[PDB]
């Protein structure tokens, strides 16, 4: 469910890598 | 920093008379790697300019029958890292060395499949067509409207689209449309702006 | 929209 | 146009043969002038047909040089390809390795490298209100950093019109005559610098 | 030539006239 | 001004016949 949270915000980097 | 093939060109190919072969090699890696092609057996010779994440694809078009086997090496380069694969194309068992003649469809031979960067940073997505006659580049956007040269965006001399000081609104799937008389080709570069 | 990209990105990146 | 002319002519022609003085660094230069923004490309070997792009006003004189920084195991031919529009010309250099060597053949010289600007425009003529992209392409290890000087010689700052790209190319937009002059590329890294001047002349009009 | 062109802008047409 | 022999230099390559 990366897309739902990370994409929507959208997230930045380290948050993305944390996912993964 | 890293660099990995995501698509690798096959290590051997067999040509077919009357046919046009497109070799495709793509990679993902840090800070805008750059793909380059060279033909022949070379040991370690060097080129061509020494002055965020990106997945970039590039292809080589063999549009004329071979008179001998040849090797085409696709070279990827970001910063310290450098990676390579080769394809050997055997000529068919059945005019060699004569580019097929008359109009040819555009094939987009250099594009970026996915681009990640930090907001406030200017990015330049590329479209390099290979097509005869010479094709025309029109750039669609995230909501599929033709680009206007607003100084927000600028389509460059080479077909590369320059999105200055990216922001969230800008995130999405940008498309390149190359058209000439005998057809079209199209490619979408994702864009995702990360934040500091 | 962006759904697939990160996953498509995801495999490669990590 | 049209069926032509689209032209292309050699201003500086690479020499037909060179001898690699041992542990030498040989830089081969070819420079050419023609219509549109020509492109120089280098390839090693003997090749029949060739492949550059392909994504198709103005008259431009372009320089490009190839840097061999390692000792050759065997003779090699270095070919410079020039292509504006439907034209193509090429010139070739065969570089003999030295008679004897105290070095490993085919091993890039190790060490710091002073910048060399390998790709520059000596003269750029285009019509007023046209956008131009001047290049500086450096070959320096460590990686060099490009500063651009205008005709006045004042450093260049990001703005409307003048703008410096990631490639090192300087992009001037909707050019006026106020812009005419000589523009300088300074490439500098930890060991030193090299410089290039790109003469620009906006033409008018028609009008 | 230079005086003709450099002092003011020159047309592409105008420059050709100079060619011998 | 600055163009000076830049033009002259350009022309000699540029035309069929040069000066």
Numbering used by the authors:
A (entry chain I): 4 to 23
B (entry chain A): 31 to 81, 92 to 134, 138 to 239
C (entry chain J): 5 to 18
D (entry chain B): 26 to 81, 91 to 241
E (entry chain G): 5 to 24
F (entry chain H): 4 to 22
Task: Give sentences copied directly from the paper behind this entry.
Imp-L2 can bind human IGF-1, IGF-2, insulin, and DILP5 with nM affinities, it counteracts insulin signalling in Drosophila being essential for resistance to starvation, while its overexpression leads to an extension of the lifespan. Here, we report the crystal structures of the Drosophila Imp-L2 protein in its apo-form, and in holo-complexes with insect DILP5 and human IGF-1. The three-dimensional characterisation of the Imp-L2 IBP in its free and hormone-complex forms revealed its fold and hormone-binding mode that are entirely different from, and unrelated to, IGFBP-1-6. The apo-Imp-L2 consists of two, similar, immunoglobulin-(Ig)-like fold domains, each of them with two-sandwiched layers of ~6–7 anti-parallel β-strands.
The Imp-L2:DILP5 complex revealed 1:1 Imp-L2:hormone mode of binding. Imp-L2:DILP5 complex formation is correlated with the propensity of Imp-L2 to form a new type of the dimer. The crystal asymmetric unit contains here two independent, but practically identical dimers (rms of 1.0 Å), that are entirely different from the apo-Imp-L2 dimer (discussed further in detail in relation to the Imp-L2 apo→holo related quaternary transitions). The DILP5 hormone binds to Imp-L2 top id-β-sheet mainly by its B-helix that is almost perpendicular to the direction of id-β-strands. The helix runs in Ig-CT→Ig-NT direction, and is mostly engaged with the N- and C-termini part of the id-β surface. The hormone B-chain α−helix:Imp-L2 β-sheet interactions are depleted of specific, tight and directional side-chain:side-chain contacts, which are mostly of a van der Waals, hydrophobic nature over ca. ~835 Å2 buried interface. The Imp-L2 contributes βB-βE:βAC-βG-βF strands to the complex (mainly Trp32, Met58, Ile93, Leu159, Trp211, Met214, Phe233, Tyr215), while B-helix side chains are limited here to AlaB9, MetB13, ValB16, AlaB17. However, there is also more specific shape complementarity between DILP5 B-chain and the id-β-sheet as, for example, hormone MetB13 fills a hydrophobic cavity formed by Met58, Trp32, Ile93 and Leu159 of the Imp-L2. Firstly, the conformation of the N-terminus of B-chain (B1–B5) of DLP5 must change, as its extended—so-called T-like—structure, observed in its free state39 and in some insulins, would clash with the id-β-sheet surface. The positioning of the hormone on the id-β-sheet leads to a greater separation of the N- and C-termini of the Imp-L2, from ~12 Å in apo-Imp-L2, to over 20 Å distance between the Cα atoms at sites 30 and 240.
